Design a protein around this ligand. Structure first.
Ligand SMILES: NC(=O)c1ccc[n+]([C@@H]2O[C@H](COP(=O)([O-])OP(=O)(O)OC[C@H]3O[C@@H](n4cnc5c(N)ncnc54)[C@H](OP(=O)(O)O)[C@@H]3O)[C@@H](O)[C@H]2O)c1
Ligand SMILES: CCc1nc(N)nc(N)c1OCCCOc1ccccc1CCC(=O)O
Length: 163
């Protein structure tokens, strides 16, 4: 199983200024619960965005996709394409593509599941924003209820699978 997992504003923003432009603890907990013990595949810019105590992401096999063949990434496995990342020498029952926008676009045709957090935060897109992939008619999904975070934002989780 190859899955994508992301959190987006309702406007589709996933990233700004090298980070994520909201604070949603319940989404971090969801992300940890879904990914712990599994492989997490990410683009190099997402690797560089990880906060210090989470670079590498603890308890997960971290795989970083870069064209920089000689790149040192302590705590992660460096590979040269998304296809390499999805062709491990040691297979994993679950592989999660964890971003960013560039890598999601390449991974979506190869994936069978998407786990999406929708965040009701008003962020009109700015020119350098990273944006979420869009799910077309080849995907179908289910939505959780709208919830309110202890930190204030409304949010909800969606689970999509390839038809
Ligand atoms: N809200 C969320 O769920 C979420 C999740 C993840 C990330 N984010 C945010 O998204 C942003 C980062 O996303 P991004 O789209 O800018 O970058 P990204 O997808 O994380 O990384 C892009 C990098 O991946 C490498 N890459 C891309 N295509 C490749 C290919 N065909 N072969 C080999 N390497 C390839 C390149 O690395 P090199 O330049 O090293 O060659 C490229 O610069 C940040 O703001 C981050 O905080 C948000
Ligand atoms: C938690 C944000 C996030 N949320 C969802 N639903 N999917 C993602 N792919 C994602 O991005 C994962 C990469 C960025 O990870 C972080 C960014 C800022 C703080 C903490 C973490 C993850 C830390 C961890 O899991 O140990």
């Amino acid at each position: 199983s190859v899955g994508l997992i992301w959190a987006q504003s309702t406007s589709g923003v996933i990233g700004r200024d090298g980070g994520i432009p909201w604070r949603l603890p319940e989404d971090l907990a969801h992300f940890k619960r879904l990914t712990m013990g599994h492989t997490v595949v990410m683009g190099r810019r997402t690797w560089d965005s990880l906060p210090a105590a989470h670079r590498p992401l603890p308890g997960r096999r971290n795989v970083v996709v870069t064209r920089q063949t000689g790149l040192v990434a302590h705590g992660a496995q460096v590979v040269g394409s998304l296809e390499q990342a999805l062709s491990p020498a040691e297979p994993d029952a679950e592989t999660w593509v964890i971003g960013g926008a560039q890598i999601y676009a390449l991974a979506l045709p190869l994936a069978n599941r998407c786990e999406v957090t929708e965040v009701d935060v008003d962020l009109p897109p700015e020119d350098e924003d990273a944006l979420a992939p869009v799910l077309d008619q080849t995907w179908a999904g289910t939505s959780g209820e709208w919830l309110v975070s202890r930190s204030g934002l409304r949010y909800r989780m969606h689970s999509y699978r390839r038809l």
